[PDB]
Design a protein around this nucleic acid. Structure first.
Ligand SMILES: [K+]
Ligand SMILES: [K+]
Ligand SMILES: [K+]
Ligand SMILES: [K+]
Ligand SMILES: [K+]
Ligand SMILES: [K+]
Ligand SMILES: [K+]
Ligand SMILES: [K+]
Ligand SMILES: [K+]
Ligand SMILES: [K+]
Ligand SMILES: [Mg+2]
Ligand SMILES: [Mg+2]
Ligand SMILES: [Mg+2]
Ligand SMILES: [Mg+2]
Ligand SMILES: [Mg+2]
Ligand SMILES: [Mg+2]
Ligand SMILES: [Mg+2]
Ligand SMILES: [Mg+2]
Ligand SMILES: [Mg+2]
Ligand SMILES: [Mg+2]
Ligand SMILES: [Mg+2]
Ligand SMILES: [Mg+2]
Ligand SMILES: [Mg+2]
Ligand SMILES: [Mg+2]
Ligand SMILES: [Mg+2]
Ligand SMILES: [Mg+2]
Lengths: 230, 259, 186, 145
RNA sequence: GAAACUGCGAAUGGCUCAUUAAAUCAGUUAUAGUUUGUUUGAUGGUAUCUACUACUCGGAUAACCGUAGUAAUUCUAGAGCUAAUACGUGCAACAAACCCCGACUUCUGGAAGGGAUGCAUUUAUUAGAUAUGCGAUGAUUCAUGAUAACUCGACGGAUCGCACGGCCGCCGGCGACGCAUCAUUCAAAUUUCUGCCCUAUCAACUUUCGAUGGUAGGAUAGUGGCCUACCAUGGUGGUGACGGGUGACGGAGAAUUAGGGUUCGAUUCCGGAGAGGGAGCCUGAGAAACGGCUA
């Protein structure tokens, strides 16, 4: 069948097809989470350990982790879970769909694999280069952790380090940097101060109202007592 | 139905709104607010149907979204906001202050009031009880809650509320000899002085009211609003002073005016 | 599901009622909790009408029990179920329902009695004076005293474990205690 | 005396095993028997104030309030336990013939142990919350007849 | 500013009259027998207590990008990023008063120290009077207060826009969104009394397996044989029960008019019910929803 090999370290993927049953014998009877040595799968895959991630069958149905069968079953699935995306469907809506079991079998049409251990010889399409991350950290804490900044270092200046510059299709010069989140600014401190002040004013108003009511009751009771004595 | 209704058919709108039969299939459904749906006058009717500042629904929304209309000294941007009895409607741009009062025919009338008279309103007390921590409070029939009320104030009394400070500045006890206006029933909008009160255990109480011309009528306790102490109302009444005129005398006056 | 409507019932005359609408969600019922005594506490959260919350107790071990005469409430352990008025089978299964008669550990109440009255069922002069003053009105029901010997106290569950998730109650006293002891002595 | 059930019957909220005594305490306080006046001009029977029966559905000593419609009728049946059938007799107007026809209504009503009723006497029943499948009324007064 | 996440809505409206004969429904009642997103008015004081970010906590995922499967679907699996008013945590500005234990003590005392103490839940005890203080109703051990405890509490703001100021870094305005409590408004659910066409070639019916009532429980938002266990034999009926028919949804109303009456009411307003027939259910304040799901 076909194979989808992904290298998280380098962010590279490649499609591989095998038609020899002897090589595929290693993957058969394995499960979605188990690891398979790449020695059987070709010769250039020596020293490479592959971790299964999933795959589809000859009808396109995906494999579901936990279904300990090699066949296809029907399950009632929640939206957002694997094998049921449920885009455009209502909240709390479930659907009965067909999924294949987690056990590898010849009925599969493709397998998804992840390189967990690198072998002696690199593969020309996977490990030669690495695709850089497009977006850097956006949270202030993440930026501080990335550059090992202290509590006094200005995280603002380090954002320009990974800002990406480019030329628009018109030929214009443009640059883009992320907006930092969870960054302490004077406005946040002012908002906190205003919250505390509002709490203080509420407490003071309640105390004053209670005192005024007690005074009114005391005055009325004094008047009533004076009336009673006569 | 499976839940709250959001529409109001025009024929089902209260008759005192005076909506055209063929104006449309729907009427503005009053929003939740201090006043009940059947006993309110939405701002859309006031601005479009009554004052004619807006010629359309869209114009009403446009006027209101500029923050130009205030109800009880607070800016309201909701077209279907329920404005009811004794409420003050002010438009600072036009220097207009209105008080919502029932005319002799039982329909809300925008009574122009002075600047001083626009700083307060009257409210009817529903009940007085103890809140959390034992704090006494009372609630009015316009959805208001006031803590630490005067111990003398009790249910069915009228309190003078200062809108600027949101404080009770005076109150009227419900008693015989007080000028009142009827806020419900066939006698809605009439003004007179209470003569006697009939109380029936486990049943509604009947109030007997005498008009300034000696005409007598009776209504339920919940339909009586006290307007002052004695015979002088604390607020200016609309034209007619709550005097219901028979159709014969109305026709006589109309014919006299014609000539 | 379980329905609380009267449509399925007969008329007071005995005649049959013909259906004119389907079941409504606002007249539903849910399965009983059937709470039991077990060291493995398990309380389930139920979302009910209006977004409110109910607590379904499947297994409870301890409860909040109060001594009426002494005006003392302590958290103790429920030992077993001895009597149930509604159904005798509910005693065999150790079901925890309101008004069931249970035996609770007396250790917290014994400790409170020792600390308060200075009696078993260093010290400062002021504490001794306080205890002596409290000793004048120290009157104890003999039946409760005999119960304290075995370490268990008869109690009645006054809460609803299937609704609030707690098996709270009070200790039997006086005529009620005599009544239930007589019913249990058989 | 009244402990004829499998469970102990008592008035809720009436603490009995108190160290103090209910000498000057109001009803329901200090262990004293609880009772109340239902209003509407009705008088609490002397048998409910000094009785020993436990009845949570009793208007004067139970947990049921009287509100709604007060009706009069004749005791049609007194065979149930603390429940009677009250037959109300009235005339229905037949408009076309300008005449009347006799009609009756059977109204199940709870009767407290403080009342002694018999088939044929006049009774006054007040409305309360549903008490059983068909009972919505409580006996408030009996005329022996 | 597309896209996407988040939030809200889609329970309204429109359509139809199949089922349904004290049932729906009309008038008239009740909730002291309950729930109620929202609007309007008021109200938010104890979290770490010996870890010890609060000048601000943590881990993901969409869009995006790139390896795809299937004949195929807002059918679907891996891989690489990155946000929050998403998710999960967490200091929660600081007190007083009340209650319990209480070393120590000039000891009928007061005393260091400790425990408890927000709001909410649950159960007990207690006050809540009224022929020198104490609220409301026709009527409530009602509102509400106090004590003992209890709960492995989705609560008690790690949010956002405008401006730009006064003291000596500290303070500071106008708003938005959001959490909790009460009241109110918008409503529902159940409910009291009276009322419906033809038929006796329908006179007895209901009660194993709830029929009528009682006791104790369970369930419910809440009352109730609504359900369970035990107990009693009850409940309706020529003042027509029960059974059957209806080419029967009920009403506001329509036609005709001496008066009385006769006939009609599917259809635009009100109320109910249904979404090919049943049944079950998630989400949600609200649905037994069907331009939602499951059989
Ligand atoms: K931010
Ligand atoms: K959306
Ligand atoms: K919704
Ligand atoms: K009705
Ligand atoms: K009082
Ligand atoms: K009818
Ligand atoms: K119930
Ligand atoms: K029962
Ligand atoms: K119908
Ligand atoms: K919602
Ligand atoms: Mg609709
Ligand atoms: Mg039909
Ligand atoms: Mg009826
Ligand atoms: Mg509300
Ligand atoms: Mg209370
Ligand atoms: Mg019950
Ligand atoms: Mg019709
Ligand atoms: Mg038809
Ligand atoms: Mg049609
Ligand atoms: Mg309709
Ligand atoms: Mg439906
Ligand atoms: Mg069809
Ligand atoms: Mg279908
Ligand atoms: Mg359906
Ligand atoms: Mg359709
Ligand atoms: Mg629809």
């Amino acid at each position: 069948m076909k194979f989808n090999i992904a290298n998280p370290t380098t962010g590279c993927q490649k499609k591989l097809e095998i038609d020899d049953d002897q090589k595929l014998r290693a993957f058969f009877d394995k499960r979605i989470s188990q690891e398979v040595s790449g020695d059987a799968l070709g010769d250039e895959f020596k020293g490479y350990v592959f971790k299964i991630m999933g795959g589809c069958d000859k009808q396109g149905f995906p494999m579901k982790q936990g279904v300990l069968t090699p066949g296809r079953v029907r399950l009632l699935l929640y939206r957002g879970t694997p094998c049921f995306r449920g885009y455009g469907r209502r909240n709390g809506e479930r659907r009965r769909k067909s999924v294949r079991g987690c056990i590898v079998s010849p009925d599969l049409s493709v397998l998804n694999l992840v390189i967990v251990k690198k072998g002696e010889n690199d593969l020309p399409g996977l490990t030669d280069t690495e695709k850089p991350r497009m977006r850097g950290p956006k949270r202030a804490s993440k930026i501080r952790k990335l550059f090992n900044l202290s509590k006094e270092d200005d995280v603002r200046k380090y954002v320009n380090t990974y800002r990406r510059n480019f030329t628009t299709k018109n030929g214009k010069k443009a640059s883009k940097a992320p907006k930092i989140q969870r960054l302490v600014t004077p406005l946040t401190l002012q908002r906190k101060r205003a919250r505390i002040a509002d709490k203080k004013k509420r407490i003071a108003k309640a105390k004053s109202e209670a005192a005024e009511y007690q005074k009114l009751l005391a005055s009325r009771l004094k008047e009533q007592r004076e009336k009673r004595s006569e | 139905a499976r839940g709250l209704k959001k529409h109001l058919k025009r024929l089902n709108a209260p008759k005192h709104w005076m909506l055209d039969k063929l104006g449309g299939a729907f009427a503005p459904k009053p929003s939740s607010g201090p006043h009940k749906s059947r006993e309110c006058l939405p701002l859309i009717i006031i601005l479009r149907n009554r004052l004619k500042y807006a010629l359309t629904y869209r114009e009403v929304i446009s006027i209101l979204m500029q923050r130009q209309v205030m109800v009880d000294s607070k800016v309201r941007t909701d077209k279907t906001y329920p404005a009811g009895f004794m409420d003050v409607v002010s438009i600072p741009k036009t220097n207009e202050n209105f008080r919502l009062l029932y005319d002799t025919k039982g329909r809300f009338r925008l009574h122009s009031v002075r600047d001083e008279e626009a700083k307060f309103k009257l409210c009817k007390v529903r009940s007085v009880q103890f809140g959390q921590k034992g704090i006494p409070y009372l609630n009015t029939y316009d959805g208001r809650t006031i803590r630490y009320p005067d111990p003398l104030i009790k249910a069915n009394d009228t309190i003078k509320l200062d809108l600027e400070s949101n404080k009770i500045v005076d109150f009227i006890k419900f008693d015989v000899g007080n000028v009142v206006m009827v806020t419900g029933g066939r006698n809605r909008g009439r003004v007179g002085v209470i003569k006697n009160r009939e109380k029936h255990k486990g049943s509604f109480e009947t109030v007997h009211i005498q008009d300034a011309l000696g005409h007598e009528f009776a209504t339920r306790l919940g339909n009586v609003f006290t307007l002052g102490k004695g015979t002088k109302p604390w607020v200016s009444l609309p034209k007619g002073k709550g005097i219901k005129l028979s159709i014969i005398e109305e026709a006589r006056k109309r014919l006299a005016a014609q000539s | 599901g379980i329905s609380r409507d009267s449509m399925h019932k007969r008329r007071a005359t005995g005649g049959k009622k013909k259906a004119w609408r389907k079941k409504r969600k606002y007249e539903l019922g849910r399965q009983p909790a059937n709470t039991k005594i077990s060291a493995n506490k398990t309380v389930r959260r139920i979302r009910v009408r209006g977004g409110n919350v109910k607590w379904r107790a499947l297994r409870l071990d301890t409860g909040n029990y109060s001594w009426g005469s002494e005006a003392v409430t302590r958290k103790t352990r429920i030992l077993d179920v001895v009597y149930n008025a509604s159904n005798n089978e509910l005693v065999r299964t150790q079901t925890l329902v309101k008004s069931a008669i249970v035996q609770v550990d007396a250790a917290p109440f014994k400790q409170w009695y020792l600390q308060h009255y200075g009696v078993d069922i260093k010290k400062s002069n002021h504490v001794l004076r306080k205890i002596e003053t409290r000793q004048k009105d120290r009157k104890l029901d003999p039946h409760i005293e005999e119960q304290f010997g075995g370490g268990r106290l008869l109690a009645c569950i006054s809460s609803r474990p299937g609704q609030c998730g707690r098996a709270d109650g009070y200790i039997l006293e006086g005529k009620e205690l005599e009544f239930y002891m007589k019913k249990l002595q058989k | 005396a009244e402990q004829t059930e499998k469970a102990f019957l008592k008035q809720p909220g009436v603490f009995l095993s108190s160290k103090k005594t209910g000498k000057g305490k109001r009803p329901g306080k200090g262990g004293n028997r609880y009772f109340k006046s239902i209003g509407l001009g009705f008088k609490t029977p002397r048998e409910a104030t000094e009785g020993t029966y436990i009845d949570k559905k009793c208007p004067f000593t139970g947990n049921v309030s009287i509100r709604g419609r007060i009706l009069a009728g004749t005791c049609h049946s007194a065979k149930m336990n603390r429940t009677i059938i009250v037959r109300r007799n009235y005339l229905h107007y037949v408009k076309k013939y300008q005449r009347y026809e006799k009609r009756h209504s059977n109204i199940p009503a709870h009767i407290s142990p403080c009342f002694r009723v018999k088939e044929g006497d006049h009774v006054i029943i007040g409305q309360c919350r549903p008490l059983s499948k068909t009972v919505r009324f409580n006996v408030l007064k009996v005329i022996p007849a």
